Design a protein around this ligand. Structure first.
Ligand SMILES: Cc1cc(-c2cc(C(N)=O)n[nH]2)c(C)s1
Ligand SMILES: [Ca+2]
Length: 122
């Protein structure tokens, strides 16, 4: 869920999870368009993963799961079921993705009217 998403992103990356709450065309609730940069690509990929998790019968925004932060890296487990392992994979992946990127301040609170109606495929 969101609690573990916050946790994993701060474990691996150098910045507040607040930095990703309305950013580019994809970072935050929903999203459409051409991704503005690497960070926005990370969020498009996470959007896709969560979509996949939902199609598999999971609730990626609410379901709790255990994990450990060891040397600023995410270890998933123990998992009680398949959904917990999918969810932790999705959050691990975005966390690793975002930790490798430079932040572009200009994309924080970017106008949605500049985001195209079509998106890249998942
Ligand atoms: C608390 C956090 C939310 C997000 C987030 C991801 C997305 C997304 N994939 O659109 N939106 N907010 C982080 C990276 S930490
Ligand atoms: Ca999104």
């Amino acid at each position: 869920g969101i609690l573990e998403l916050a946790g994993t992103v701060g474990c691996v990356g150098p910045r507040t999870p607040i930095a990703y709450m309305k950013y580019g065309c994809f970072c935050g609730l929903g999203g459409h368009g051409q991704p503005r940069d690497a960070i926005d690509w990370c969020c498009h990929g996470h959007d896709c993963c969560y979509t996949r998790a939902e199609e598999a019968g999971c609730s990626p925004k609410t379901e709790r799961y255990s994990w450990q932060c060891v040397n600023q890296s995410v270890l998933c487990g123990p998992a009680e079921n398949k959904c917990q392992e999918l969810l932790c994979k999705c959050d691990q992946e975005i966390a690793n993705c975002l930790a490798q990127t430079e932040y572009n301040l200009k994309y924080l609170f970017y106008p949605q009217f500049l985001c195209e109606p079509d998106s890249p495929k998942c």
